[PDB]
């Protein structure tokens, strides 16, 4: 397939070829043009707070070690020995000043440097150039309010610019709330879906909630519960959708601070978020304070998703075109009482974790939609994302980005796939930029 020419995503992101969820050659191409090029979620300050603390993380199909340095910075390195390529670290988290390879005993520092080689003097003499044998380092590592992302491509925009218009929406909860903590360890489960299936669902799919999650809505006694079985449509003005230049986007459901949490947490959460909102009015204004306690379903392009207020935090780690390893963490506000944080974390896993009853509702949808992308008669068929097209705006006086002023639509699908196509057809960041110079105009046509 010629990725320079092949139209995988139509103009304005209105449709995508179904093969994108199934084609293994395209998956391999994505490793280069999506995962090796873009910002990927690694960890949070709260999981590696002290010097020597480290975790392992996936970046695409590669594995990295993510380590807190003595100077307080974070550096990340391929989890691969520079000698004969053995996997250096076999655990998920810990604290160490270095990592020793179990094959021939080479010792690397937390700073990636080759610090020791067994019997170096007797064996290599002075001939081993250790300065050139440090672990392969992730070129870019940046933080968004404690949330640590990495990028293999030195040419990437800074993480803040990469978030584009989505940053404005995330800031009330990520910054102005006093800060979030990630509660680990994550749940980890393999699903037989393409990584794009859950990514697209979290970025912009409010339409599916009433029908897909009918049983969870009816049973689980949450606030979004009126929607069960499409019994009711959210009223006009119930929310909006947004998307951005570099692909990130989200839905906003006004006031939904208790999210998917069952009735046992609803009064406590609604009291807590409302109290903080009252304080934030004076600091960031009424609209942004309201956004703080509004439910955001967001994907940070390409494969990191979240539900704020519900507190669900996801990484859709790619394995092959029909296999994805799902990592599920909980996010909590630092200034919540500890007992509430504990119950919120359990509730995140209860609803969206490995035995998450909500998340289970999505399995067949995402697995079969992905697997159908391999089927002969469906490869060249068109997946539709035209809902709300022709009613999106850009440059709004209050809400930034490409915005659909309705709670349910496919605005965020369109921006996600516009960015996806621009990357797949580009050889580098400069080409992506050239392919994106009229990004918002394309999305708001008609």
């Amino acid at each position: 397939m010629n990725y320079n020419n092949k139209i995988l995503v139509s103009e304005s992101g209105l449709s995508q070829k179904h093969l994108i969820h199934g084609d293994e050659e395209l998956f391999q191409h994505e490793l280069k043009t999506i995962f090796a090029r873009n910002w990927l979620f690694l960890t949070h300050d709260s999981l590696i707070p002290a010097p020597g603390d480290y975790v392992t993380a996936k970046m695409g199909i590669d594995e990295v070690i993510v380590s807190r340095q003595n100077d307080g910075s974070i550096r990340a390195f391929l989890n691969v020995c520079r000698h004969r390529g053995k996997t250096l670290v076999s655990v998920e988290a810990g604290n160490a000043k270095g990592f020793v390879c179990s094959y021939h005993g080479w010792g690397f520092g937390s700073n990636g440097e080759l610090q020791s080689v067994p019997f170096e003097k007797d064996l290599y003499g002075e001939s081993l150039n250790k300065k050139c044998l440090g672990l392969k380092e992730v070129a870019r590592v940046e933080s968004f309010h404690g949330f640590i992302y990495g990028c293999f491509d030195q040419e990437a925009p800074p993480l803040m610019d990469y978030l584009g218009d989505a940053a404005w929406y995330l800031e009330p909860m990520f910054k102005h709330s006093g800060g979030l903590e990630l509660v680990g360890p994550p749940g980890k489960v393999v699903i037989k879906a393409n990584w794009k299936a859950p990514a697209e669902n979290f970025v912009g799919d409010a339409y599916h909630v009433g029908w897909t999650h009918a049983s969870s809505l009816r049973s689980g006694e949450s606030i979004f519960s009126s929607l069960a079985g499409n019994a009711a449509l959210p009223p006009e003005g119930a929310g909006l959708q947004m998307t951005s230049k570099y692909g990130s986007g989200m839905g906003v459901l006004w006031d939904g601070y208790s999210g998917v949490h069952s009735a046992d947490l609803v009064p406590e959460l609604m009291a807590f978020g409302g109290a903080k909102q009252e304080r934030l009015n004076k600091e960031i204004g009424d609209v942004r304070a309201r956004i703080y306690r509004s439910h955001l379903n967001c994907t940070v392009f390409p494969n990191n998703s979240m539900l704020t207020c519900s507190g669900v935090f996801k990484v859709w780690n790619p394995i092959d075109a029909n296999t994805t390893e799902v990592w599920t963490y909980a996010i909590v506000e630092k200034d919540m009482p500890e007992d509430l944080k504990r119950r919120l974390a359990d509730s995140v896993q209860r609803t969206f974790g490995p035995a998450g009853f909500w998340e289970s509702d999505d399995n067949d949808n995402m697995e079969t939609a992905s697997q159908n992308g391999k089927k002969y008669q469906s490869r060249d068929s068109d997946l539709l994302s035209n809902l709300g097209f022709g009613e999106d705006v850009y440059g709004d006086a209050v809400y930034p980005g490409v915005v659909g002023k309705s709670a349910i639509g496919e605005t965020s699908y369109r921006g996600f796939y516009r960015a996806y196509q621009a990357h797949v057809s580009s050889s580098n960041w400069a080409e992506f930029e050239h392919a994106s110079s009229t990004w918002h105009t394309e999305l708001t046509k008609t």
Partner: protein, 192 residues
């Protein structure tokens, strides 16, 4: 068991061993086997309301954890060692049961098929609460659906059972430390 000598044994595991090695009551092991076989039968036929009514105590904690992989020699890193795949009280189990029984649970059509294999049953009365029964057992759980989906779960279960209404022994605690860190079964949406 001296865990200073038996280096791979956790303090928790050594304590649980001690419980069964002492007083051995054959009749209790047989009662426990019956209790667990009947529980597994109710679950296998998806009689989830019957399971709650007959097998599950009002004060239950039903917990399955997933433990983060850490170095055997790790002694500095102290953050949360595990997450809860399940950590349910009775009302939370009821929510999950209602979710299973809801006619708009699309994943349950066509009807799933469950087969459970319960082995290695051990039973001992608590030394301090003479009405508290400790039961340990291992489960293989086979779930088949949708023509060619087959998921097999494997776990050890540390239970506490106590006589409730009508004198019927019911589950007041189940603890499972799930042995596979990354699930390869699509989800853990089964009652172990």
């Amino acid at each position: 068991i001296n865990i200073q000598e038996d280096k791979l044994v956790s303090a928790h595991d050594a304590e649980e061993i001690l419980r069964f090695f002492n007083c051995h009551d054959s009749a209790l092991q047989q009662e426990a086997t019956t209790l667990l076989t009947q529980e597994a039968h109710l679950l296998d036929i998806q009689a989830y309301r019957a399971w709650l009514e007959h097998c599950v105590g009002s004060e239950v904690q039903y917990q399955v954890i997933s433990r983060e992989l850490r170095a055997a020699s790790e002694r500095r890193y102290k953050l949360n060692e595990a997450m809860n795949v399940y950590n349910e009280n009775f009302q939370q189990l009821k929510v999950r049961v209602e979710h299973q029984l809801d006619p708009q649970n699309w994943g349950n059509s066509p009807k799933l098929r469950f087969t459970r294999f319960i082995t290695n049953v051990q039973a001992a009365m608590d030394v301090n609460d003479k009405e508290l029964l400790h039961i340990r057992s291992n489960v293989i759980l086979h779930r088949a659906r949708r023509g060619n989906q087959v998921d097999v779960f494997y776990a050890a279960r540390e239970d506490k059972w106590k006589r409730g209404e009508g004198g019927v022994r019911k589950l007041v605690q189940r603890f499972v430390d799930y042995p596979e860190r990354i699930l390869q079964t699509h989800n853990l949406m089964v009652f172990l």
